[PDB]
């Protein structure tokens with residue numbers, strides 16, 4: 001059982017964590033200042049979003065030099081000190097690895113775009129248009145065609161994401177060797193983990209035939225069907241990860257769940273663990289902007305399908321939130337002032353008793369909410385400007401339809417500054433924050449949470465302890481008591497003849513729970529929103545609105 005199977009991770013979007021120089025952008029110094037806070041919470045390891053030199057058309061996901069640090073975050077010396085200060089606390093760092101595409105300002109692309117005979121030409125994908133139009137019908141995730149004509153050579157380069165994010169050509173051995181050398185540069189600095197963004201799209205289909213209309217309906221899935229993908233990931237492991245001790249994590253965006261085992265089965269020598277989208281997008285329409293009503297029954301059944309593809313040799317991450325999705329309490333909980341803390345704790349109990357390695361998103365430990373967008377600029381983000389181009393400019397929807405829906409699903413919901421206290425701009429910055437702070441910072445902030453044994457924060461800290469001390473709760477098997485139940489989420493975790501029972505009321509009303517025939521409460525480890533723990537030997541539970549609990553059973 002490697003260290004990573006029982007670790008609890010915390011994801012820090014540095015741009016919005018803590019500013020230390022007034023420019024309104026979070027930075028490395030600000031993260032280094034808060035390690036004590038993170039340690040005190042119980043956090044073993046941090047995954048930071050892209051921290052490399054970038055023009056920031058996509059807040060670090062368009063990388064212009066893989067070997068320099070983002071100017072906004074600090075210098076290489078600031079990154080080294082972060083590493084050092086993490087190590088002092090026996091903490092580990094996972095970095096984000098963005099090698100499906102680079103920025104169009106990367107030196108490689110500047111060279112590549114110069115002529116068709118340039119030595120870098122095949123570091124990207126260049127093709128002639130067909131029939132006066134693009135080379136084929138590929139759509140981009142961030143608006144319009146995935147192909148962009150370059151007047152310099154008259155050909156089109158491929159970009160699955162933004163126009164300023166040209167896809168890297170993995171079919172070219174020289175480029176793969178460069179990528180590997182780049183990974184060693186960071187690994188040699190002692191980085192403990194790497195998360196590969198959109199790891200499933202690295203392999204492109206030879207010939208670039210047009211997508212079928214079915215394929216066009218789910219293009220994301222088509223872009224994960226490159227015929228050399230597993231070949232390339234296995235090569236990366238042989239030449240890189242085999243020689244180091246880091247954990248690898250794949251963001252498997254767009255792939256069908258049944259293919260996930262190919263990425264994570266320890267025996268195949270590709271990656272260690274999976275970030276999947278089935279759960280967190282379980283109520284998102286195919287357009288990635290509308291929502292579809294779902295029940296708890298939908299929620300638990302997805303989790304069960306997801307757990308099942310881990311098998312014996314695979315391993316999952318678990319998360320309810322990240323920098324690409326709405327806030328966990330607003331999305332899966334109830335964010336109204338009277339149910340917010342109660343449901344946030346109930347979500348905490350879920351997160352920390354899932355099988356897999358949990359990732360907690362910055363701010364969820366405080367019960368941070370979605371942002372109340374009013375304006376146009378509140379929504380500012382390459383992906384929504386993409387939705388405008390594809391849905392508004394084309395007359396498929398009105399701006400106000402877009403914004404009503406995007407208010408609920410926008411990435412910007414997760415990127416509002418972390419709420420440290422009740423000072424100006426919640427103590428995030430002394431300047432003017434890059435995105436506005438949520439007004440509810442006056443009720444929802446770290447300083448107020450940490451001082452209160454009854455807070456969301458304190459509930460998270462207690463859960464993390466209980467998990468750290470209970471093997472079954474990280475590496476134990478998982479079993480859903482009743483997948484068709486849409487009121488109360490019940491499951492067991494077991495290891496080595498010990499069994500724990502997690503019960504979570506998802507209704508804002510009293511509910512009852514009857515334990516499995518022959519099973520009885522032995523001890524109560526923790527509850528939220530309960531006025532009294534069950535009696536030793538209880539065969540059922542009386543549950544308050546939003547109540548959660550962990551029990552040892554016999």
Ligand SMILES: OC[C@H]1O[C@@](CO)(O[C@H]2O[C@H](CO)[C@@H](O)[C@H](O)[C@H]2O)[C@@H](O)[C@@H]1O
Nearest residue numbers: 058061141161197198251253323324383
């Ligand atoms: O937000 C659109 C879509 O992008 C994904 C692809 O994995 O997210 C990763 O890659 C993007 C493009 O570089 C980034 O904008 C994003 O921040 C990054 O995590 C999906 O998760 C997401 O649905």
Ligand SMILES: [Ca+2]
Nearest residue numbers: 020021025027
């Ligand atoms: Ca700053």
